[PDB]
Amino acid sequence: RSQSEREEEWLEKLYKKHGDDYKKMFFDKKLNIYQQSEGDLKRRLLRWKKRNG
Amino acid sequence: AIPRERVIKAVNELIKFTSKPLLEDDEEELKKDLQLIVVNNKSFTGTSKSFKLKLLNVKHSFYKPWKEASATAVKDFKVLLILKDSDIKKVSEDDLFDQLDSEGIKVDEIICGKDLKTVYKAYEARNAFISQFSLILADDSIVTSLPKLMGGKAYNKVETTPISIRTHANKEFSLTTLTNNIKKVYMNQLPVKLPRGTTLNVHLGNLEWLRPEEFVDNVELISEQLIKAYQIRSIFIKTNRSPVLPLYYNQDVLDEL
Amino acid sequence: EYSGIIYVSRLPHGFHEKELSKYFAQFGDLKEVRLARNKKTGNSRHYGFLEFVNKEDAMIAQESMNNYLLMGHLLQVRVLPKGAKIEKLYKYKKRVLVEKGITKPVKQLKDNMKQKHEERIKKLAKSGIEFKW
Amino acid sequence: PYEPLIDWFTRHEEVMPLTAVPEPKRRFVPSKNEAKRVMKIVRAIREGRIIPPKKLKEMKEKEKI
Amino acid sequence: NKFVRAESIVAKTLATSREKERIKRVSILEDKKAKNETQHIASGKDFILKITEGLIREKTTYDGKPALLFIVRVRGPLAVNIPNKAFKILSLLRLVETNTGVFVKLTKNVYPLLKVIAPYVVIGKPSLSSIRSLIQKRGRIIYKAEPHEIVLNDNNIVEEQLGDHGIICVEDIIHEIATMGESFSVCNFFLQPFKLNREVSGFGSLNRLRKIKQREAESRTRQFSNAATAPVIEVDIDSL
Amino acid sequence: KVPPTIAQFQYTLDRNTAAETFKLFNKYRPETAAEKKERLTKEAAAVAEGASPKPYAVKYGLNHVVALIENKKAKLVLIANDVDPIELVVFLPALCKKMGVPYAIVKGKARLGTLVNQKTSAVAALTEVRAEDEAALAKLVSTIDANFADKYDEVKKHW
RNA sequence: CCUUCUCAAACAUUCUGUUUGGUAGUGAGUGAUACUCUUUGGAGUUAACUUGAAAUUGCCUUAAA
């Protein structure tokens, strides 16, 4: 499977706005338009990282 | 200028008075702590009761200590910025924070004349919203319209009334103009009204604010500006309706009546 | 029973006596209309009294305007019992200050101010605060 | 036979609702169906199937003359 | 007559009070400016605003040089009854009827009046072609009692009316009006200013939508500043 | 004659109150098919080349409105007085009264449909309103209550 | 059921710094003692706070028909 371009861009914003602090990302109103759980965000970030640096 | 010994004695007496031998701070924390100077004059701006505010230059304005010490209080200090509708879109909260975070000051919210007439039209909502902020900054262009939009209640107090701030460079709106004018107002000015009456009062803040020596210097600087501005009269340093402490005595003004 | 006098409150800002007379003149004829106003400022207090020549006109007006919504204000109109005649209601206008107390000579008020300053020093000394000049 | 109704049940207002039904995230989150439709329109535009409104305006401005 | 509700009366009263306050403030400011007591006022120099098509705003000062201006009634504000101060000015220019327009000479003494009647009318400087077209398309000559307002038809009638100042044809009047001629004041008064036809001039399914669109565009194109030092707003009269 | 539950309708709001209510409702007309379609196409075009707040609209579905009621979320409910299956609306006034949600009966279902871009709307209700109209919403609620519950307190009586 | 007086100059032209001018308001109620004033009757100033826009009387015509 692969992640969409928009999803990858959003994950990039999450990364270079908070880094690895999923707790802070959970409350990121601007970037986290959809109030997803910390687990889903961390899983998506790990999936994106596996395909990138 | 008046000797600093008299001001030192007055501030020492105020310090002694502040301490004397039922949970929340109803009025006590503000009655015996507020510092203000009463200036007498022959009908200050008797021609008209304009709501103009005079920004007296101060080396160490109370705004910074007010924000620092406002944390341990029910009321939280805040700054209100009012700008014209055309320039609000260009102005961005992120840019304002980035260019002002270095100095340490922050802007809680930005408002436009359109908002005041649509969302804050209600008297109850208007009073609730205005009372939240202690410092109000309004674009020079929109200050004339503000009294009609925001009513007259906000002008009953110095804190609530808007303060004119320049935001135009070469007749064109400039971000840096507002960015540094807000800083100058915050840390290099002291607003005060010009009532249509003999008595004039300036709120110097709580007693726990800038050190008494700094307070004495601020009092001297304010007195010099007032002397250079109007033909002022007897001046007293007063707490909340506490015994008045005379500081200046002008006699040539009486002969000019 | 009820009298022709009517009490109206919740009047929208700017709804002055002339507008009330024009609007209520349709219901028969109104004897007199008065609106409460402040002394220092000429703006109305948003409540006034109007009298009708006939009680039927007063009751018709009360029924029609019992809870009429007028640009954000729901007007409430009541018909007073028998009697209860309207009292005086001055047509107050804006008050402009006039200066008259400058007749005293400057020399006399100079000594008066000196004496007042001395008395103030004595008083603040009496209050438990030590100060001079 | 003909008598007025009685408010024995309606006399007291219902302070509490009937069913809890914990609110879903979609109520507090932007619509997902709208996002799906937007993505479908994006795909159609990419496939050269739907002319963007700006392109339609540009083409019509040249036309009609 | 038809019953009058309270909402309309209250709205009219509030609008009239606002207009009266604006007029009083503008007149007081203008009188002080004329007295040369410009020490403490918002602005001293006059300003004229030109708005044209997208919209571009141009602010320019007003000089003492005479200029030609065309004014057309607008019938606004909606709920504002014309006050006596504005009523006198309108009567002097006999522009009470809607859509009516006349030519006036721009002078310093006329600037306060133009500012006072600014919201009620739309002003601008028409071109020579527009003036010629307007004069040659519409016109009125009062003819003998003289209860007749027959439209201008013959050049000899022009000779009969004025005669003395060489005004023998419609082109003479056009030149006198467009140019700063001596008889500009005399001819304009006798010209019986034109009664321009209304914009939509229709009612119906399509007509209602067109009128709604025109009204919506009017608000964007025309605005009431209501400021004490409100610049005079000018639009491209040549389009009309 | 008719039982007390019937004839409860037709005791609609006065001219001024109904006009004010419709004027307020006209400020929250749900986007029609064309408006929503053009907005979505514009969003797609923006996405093609590269955070809005919650939209505000009047809730009108009979099932949707009934669901909104009994949960105290709804603030104002408008009820049509010309519903051919009267049983669909007989219980609405009493249910609203029991739940305490302010309600009113307006003349004509087509009038309700017009303000929601529908041929006929059985009911029209408001859940959330903008802060600007919050005071207006409260004033309209108070006026409706005064003109309906007190003026027509006998609407539920005298067959 | 209409919307609210959204800037004008002198210097410096580091593209924004200095100085001046333009701001007349829903009402009611509660309330911390100083300024003058004219001598009397109170005229203007001075902390703070509640409010559903609340409230019982201070002696021009085409939104035409």
Residue E32, CB-side half-sphere exposure with 13 Å CA sphere: 16
Can you tell me the distance from the alpha carbon of E114 to that of E119, in angstroms, rounded to the nearest whole number? 9
**Are C2 and C81 in contact, with CB atoms under 8 Å apart?**
yes
**Are E89 and E117 in contact, with CB atoms under 8 Å apart?**
yes
Can you tell me the distance from the alpha carbon of F78 to that of F116, in angstroms, rounded to the nearest whole number? 12
Q: Which chains touch E (3 or more CB pairs under 8 A)?
A: C
Q: Provide the total of helices (H) and of strands (E) in chain D, helices listed first.
A: 3, 0
Among residues B132, B133, B130, B108, the alpha carbon closest in space to that of B121 is found at: B130
Can you tell me the distance from the alpha carbon of F57 to that of F34, in angstroms, rounded to the nearest whole number? 16
Amino acid sitting at position E159: E
Strands B34-41 and B232-238: antiparallel
**Are C75 and C68 in contact, with CB atoms under 8 Å apart?**
yes
Burial class of residue C88 (count of CB atoms within 10 Å of its CB; 0-12, 13-18, 19+): exposed
Is C72–F16 a contact, with Cβ atoms under 8 angstroms apart? Answer: no
* SS3 assignment, position D55: helix
* Alpha-carbon distance C21 to nearest alpha carbon in chain B (angstroms): 28
Q: What is the per-residue burial (b if ≥16 Cβ within 10 Å, else e) of E1-23? A: eeeeebbebbbbbbbbeebbebb
Per the omega criterion (within 30 degrees of 0), is the bond before F102 cis?
A: no
In the block, residue with structure tokens 């069913």? D19
Largest CA distance in chain F: 68
Taking CA–CA distances from D35, the nearest residue in chain A reads A34
Residue in A34, A35, A37, A40 to test binding to D, most D beta-carbons within 10 Å: A34
Residue B111's H or E segment, with its range, is strand B109-112
Strands F76-80 and C68-70: unpaired
Can you tell me the distance from the alpha carbon of F58 to that of F65, in angstroms, rounded to the nearest whole number? 10
User: Measuring CA to CA, how many Å separate E3 from each of C6, C12, F25?
Assistant: 21, 20, 27
**Are E123 and E130 in contact, with CB atoms under 8 Å apart?**
no
Can you tell me the distance from the alpha carbon of F93 to that of D12, in angstroms, rounded to the nearest whole number? 15
Can you tell me the distance from the alpha carbon of F30 to that of F33, in angstroms, rounded to the nearest whole number? 9
Strands E67-73 and B190-193: unpaired
In the block, residue with structure tokens 């200590």? B65
Is B9–C124 a contact, with Cβ atoms under 8 angstroms apart? Answer: no
Q: Please, what sign has the CA dihedral across residues A13, A17, A19, A22?
A: negative
DSSP 8-state secondary structure symbol assigned to residue E151? P
Taking CA–CA distances from C75, the nearest residue in chain F reads F143
Can you tell me the distance from the alpha carbon of F47 to that of F51, in angstroms, rounded to the nearest whole number? 14
Can you tell me the distance from the alpha carbon of F140 to that of F25, in angstroms, rounded to the nearest whole number? 11
Partners of B79 in the β-ladder:
B135
Tally of domains within chain E: 1
List of E residues 111-170 with CB within 7 A of strand G: 120
Residues of E in contact with C64 (CB under 8 A): none
Can you tell me the distance from the alpha carbon of C36 to that of E183, in angstroms, rounded to the nearest whole number? 58
Q: What is the per-residue burial (b if ≥16 Cβ within 10 Å, else e) of F55-79? A: eeebbbbeeebbebbbebebbbbbb
List of B residues 178-237 with CB within 7 A of strand G: 180-181, 184, 193, 195-201, 203, 233-234, 236
Can you tell me the distance from the alpha carbon of C24 to that of C49, in angstroms, rounded to the nearest whole number? 12
How many CB atoms neighbour CB B244 within 10 A? 21
**Are B162 and B138 in contact, with CB atoms under 8 Å apart?**
yes
**Are B82 and B133 in contact, with CB atoms under 8 Å apart?**
no
**Are B103 and B129 in contact, with CB atoms under 8 Å apart?**
no
Structure tokens at C2: 């009820």
Which residue approaches G45 most closely, CA to C1'?
A: B197
Which residue range is the domain that position F65 belongs to?
1-159
**Are E235 and E221 in contact, with CB atoms under 8 Å apart?**
yes
Which residue range is the domain that position E89 belongs to?
2-240
Query: Are chains D and F in contact at 3+ CB pairs closer than 8 Å?
Result: yes
Is D45–F44 a contact, with Cβ atoms under 8 angstroms apart? Answer: yes
**Strand G nucleotides in reach of protein CB atoms, 7 A cut-off:** 1-9, 12-13, 15-19, 21-28, 32-39, 41-65
How many CB atoms neighbour CB A43 within 10 A? 12
Can you tell me the distance from the alpha carbon of E219 to that of C68, in angstroms, rounded to the nearest whole number? 32
* SS3 assignment, position B138: strand
Structure tokens at B220: 């001297």
Distance separating the N- and C-terminal Cα atoms of chain D: 79
Partners of E123 in the β-ladder:
E71, E234
Can you tell me the distance from the alpha carbon of C31 to that of C41, in angstroms, rounded to the nearest whole number? 27
> How many residues are present in chain D?
65
How many CB atoms neighbour CB E31 within 10 A? 11
Strand G contacted by E212 CB (< 7 A) = no
* SS3 assignment, position E97: coil
Residues of F in contact with B119 (CB under 8 A): 130-132
Q: What method did the depositors use to determine the structure?
A: cryo-EM
* Alpha-carbon distance C61 to nearest alpha carbon in chain E (angstroms): 12
CA E20, E195, E210 angle in degrees (round to 5)? 80
Strands B109-112 and B79-83: parallel
Residues of B in contact with C121 (CB under 8 A): 246
* SS3 assignment, position D49: coil
Task: Give the alpha-carbon dihedral of B42, B48, B53, B56, to 10 degrees.
Answer: -30
Q: For chain B, say whether C123 makes contact (Cβ under 8 Å).
A: yes
Rounded to 10°, the helix D53-62/F33-49 angle is: 100
List of E residues 47-76 with CB within 7 A of strand G: 47, 73, 75-76
Can you tell me the distance from the alpha carbon of F6 to that of F157, in angstroms, rounded to the nearest whole number? 10
Amino acid sitting at position C12: P
3-class secondary structure per residue, chain E:
CCCCCHHHHHHHHHHHHHHHHHHHHHHHHHHHHHCCCCCCCCCCCCEEEEEECCCEEEEEECCCCCEEEEEEECCCCCCCCCCHHHHHHHHHCCCCCCCEEEEEEECHHHHHHHHHCCCCEEEECCCHHHHHHHHHHCCCCCECCCCECCCCCCHHHHHHHCCCCCCCCHHHHHHHHHCCCCCHHHHHHHCCCCECCCCCCCCCHHHHHHHHHHHHHHHHHCCCCCCCCCCEEEECCCCC
Q: Is C72 left (phi over 0), alpha (psi -120 to 50) or beta?
A: left
Residues of D in contact with A33 (CB under 8 A): 29-30
> How many residues are present in chain F?
159
Question: Which of the nucleotides lies closest to F141 (Cα–C1')?
Answer: G52
Q: For chain C, say whether B3 makes contact (Cβ under 8 Å).
A: no
**Are F58 and F124 in contact, with CB atoms under 8 Å apart?**
yes
Strands C73-81 and C68-70: antiparallel
Rounded to 10°, the helix A5-18/A38-50 angle is: 110
Can you tell me the distance from the alpha carbon of A47 to that of A33, in angstroms, rounded to the nearest whole number? 20
How many CB atoms neighbour CB B138 within 10 A? 24
Can you tell me the distance from the alpha carbon of A3 to that of A10, in angstroms, rounded to the nearest whole number? 11
Residue D60's H or E segment, with its range, is helix D53-62
Can you tell me the distance from the alpha carbon of B163 to that of B185, in angstroms, rounded to the nearest whole number? 9
Residue C122's H or E segment, with its range, is helix C106-126
Among residues E186, E179, E180, the alpha carbon closest in space to that of E165 is found at: E186
**Are F5 and D5 in contact, with CB atoms under 8 Å apart?**
yes
Burial class of residue B129 (count of CB atoms within 10 Å of its CB; 0-12, 13-18, 19+): buried
Amino acid sitting at position B159: E
Can you tell me the distance from the alpha carbon of E121 to that of E99, in angstroms, rounded to the nearest whole number? 9
Residue A13's H or E segment, with its range, is helix A5-18
Strands E121-124 and E101-106: unpaired
Among residues F102, F101, F127, F123, the alpha carbon closest in space to that of F111 is found at: F123
CA E15, E19, E23 angle in degrees (round to 5)? 175
Amino acid sitting at position B161: T
**DSSP assignment of B73-107, as one string?**
SSS---EEEEE-HHHHTT--HHHHHHHHHTTT---
* SS3 assignment, position B200: strand
Structure tokens at B82: 């009012």
Among F47, F70, F100, beta carbon nearest to D38: F47
Tally of domains within chain F: 1
Structure tokens at E55: 């919209």
Amino acid sitting at position E14: L
Q: In what order do the strands lie in the sheet with B135-139?
A: B109-112, B79-83, B135-139, B163-165
Can you tell me the distance from the alpha carbon of B52 to that of B194, in angstroms, rounded to the nearest whole number? 7
Q: What does residue C117 show for φ and ψ, rounded to 5 degrees?
A: -65, -45
Residues of E in contact with C13 (CB under 8 A): 14
Among residues E178, E165, E180, E85, the alpha carbon closest in space to that of E131 is found at: E178
Can you tell me the distance from the alpha carbon of F61 to that of B135, in angstroms, rounded to the nearest whole number? 47
User: Measuring CA to CA, how many Å separate B91 from each of B129, B192, C62, E124?
Assistant: 21, 28, 53, 35
**Are E60 and E48 in contact, with CB atoms under 8 Å apart?**
yes
**Are B1 and B242 in contact, with CB atoms under 8 Å apart?**
no
Partners of C33 in the β-ladder:
C50
3-class secondary structure per residue, chain F:
CCCCCCCCCCCCCCHHHHHHHHHHHHHHCCCCHHHHHHHHHHHHHHHHHCCCCCCCCCECCHHHHHHHCCCCCCCEEEEECCCCCCHHHHHHHHHHHHHCCCEEEECCHHHHHHCCCCCCCCEEEECCCCHHHHHHHHHHHHHHHHHHHHCCCCCCCCC
Which residues have C-beta within 8 Å of that of residue B128, sequence separation ≥ 6?
Answer: none
Can you tell me the distance from the alpha carbon of C74 to that of F139, in angstroms, rounded to the nearest whole number? 8
User: Measuring CA to CA, how many Å separate E166 from each of E138, E202, F128?
Assistant: 22, 42, 75
* Long-range CB contacts for residues E145-152, cutoff 8 Å, separation at least 24: E149/E192
User: Measuring CA to CA, how many Å separate B46 from each of B50, B62, B63, C99, D36?
Assistant: 10, 29, 30, 10, 68
Q: In what order do the strands lie in the sheet with E101-106?
A: E56-61, E47-52, E232-235, E121-124, E67-73, E101-106
User: Measuring CA to CA, how many Å separate F63 from each of B217, F67, F124?
Assistant: 72, 6, 11
- Give the CATH number for residue F24: 3.30.1330.30
Is C19–E6 a contact, with Cβ atoms under 8 angstroms apart? Answer: yes
> How many residues are present in chain E?
240
Residue B169's H or E segment, with its range, is strand B168-169
Q: What is the per-residue burial (b if ≥16 Cβ within 10 Å, else e) of D19-58? A: eeeeeeeeeeeeeeeebebbeebbeebeeeebebeeeeee
Strand G contacted by C25 CB (< 7 A) = no
